[PDB]
């Protein structure tokens, strides 16, 4: 449900995700690096599936962050794909792909894979 | 066909893979890297499914290579997961995970993922 996803979330590395889910399935917000002052904020955009199932199933969603802002440019982009599971302890469980811009020759090792779980802290 | 997995395969990067498939599911062989070289060879071990389904499906398999031999140690290991499709143009289509030994702090970016298609040409 949009409300449930909207709010502030943190993951186990200490990064901050602030998102607003709109009624049309859109996701917009900011992502912040683990601790590290104010200019560690990047724009994110994503989509969620606004009519999940009844049942105790999660809501699929995904978003992207290109790591460039006015202070830094890490020439890479990450996409998180996962499910939102609500309750008193709502969580967003994801698997992510971080791709860096490489030359032809290093393309083979351009992508990293991992997983993060986000805990909601504020609405 | 079944032990059609046995032989020498090449991928798009130039790496060569030489494997023997046992009748009970084992996969054993050598993986050699760049240039051909001499000791660019590493041992590989895996398993395949020796009784695949009878709908034209491919044969599921996978194998691992630890990047250490008596000349080099890259403190990493790669696992390829995929399926074998035989025929006139046999291929092994895979996705792989390369994990490096890191310290806690670098654990979040310890794994790369990619895909390779191997053929006998």
């Amino acid at each position: 449900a949009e409300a449930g996803i909207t709010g502030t979330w943190y993951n186990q590395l200490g990064s901050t995700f602030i998102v607003t889910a709109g009624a049309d399935g859109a996701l917009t917000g900011t992502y912040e690096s683990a601790v590290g002052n104010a200019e560690s904020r990047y724009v994110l955009t994503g989509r969620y599936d606004s009519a999940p199932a009844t049942d105790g199933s999660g809501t699929a969603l995904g978003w992207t962050v290109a790591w460039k802002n006015n202070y830094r440019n890490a020439h890479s982009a990450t996409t998180w794909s996962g499910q939102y599971v609500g309750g008193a302890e709502a969580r967003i469980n994801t698997q992510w792909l971080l791709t860096s811009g490489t030359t032809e020759a290093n393309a083979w090792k351009s992508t990293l894979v991992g997983h993060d779980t986000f805990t909601k802290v504020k609405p | 066909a079944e032990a059609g997995i046995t032989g020498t395969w090449y991928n798009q990067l130039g790496s060569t893979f030489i494997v023997t498939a046992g009748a009970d599911g084992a996969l054993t062989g050598t993986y050699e890297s760049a240039v051909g070289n001499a000791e660019s060879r590493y041992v590989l071990t895996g398993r395949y499914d020796s009784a695949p389904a009878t709908d034209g499906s491919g044969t599921a398999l996978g194998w691992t290579v630890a990047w250490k031999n008596n000349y080099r140690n890259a403190h990493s290991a790669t696992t390829w997961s995929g399926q074998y499709v035989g025929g006139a143009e046999a291929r092994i289509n895979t996705q792989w995970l390369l994990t490096s030994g890191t310290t806690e702090a670098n654990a979040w970016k310890s794994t790369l993922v990619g895909h390779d298609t191997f053929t006998k040409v």
Binding site: - | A34, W67, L98
Partner: peptide, 8 residues
């Protein structure tokens, strides 16, 4: 890395 292409 031994998994990649030649360094040539």
């Amino acid at each position: 890395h031994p998994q990649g292409p030649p360094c040539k």
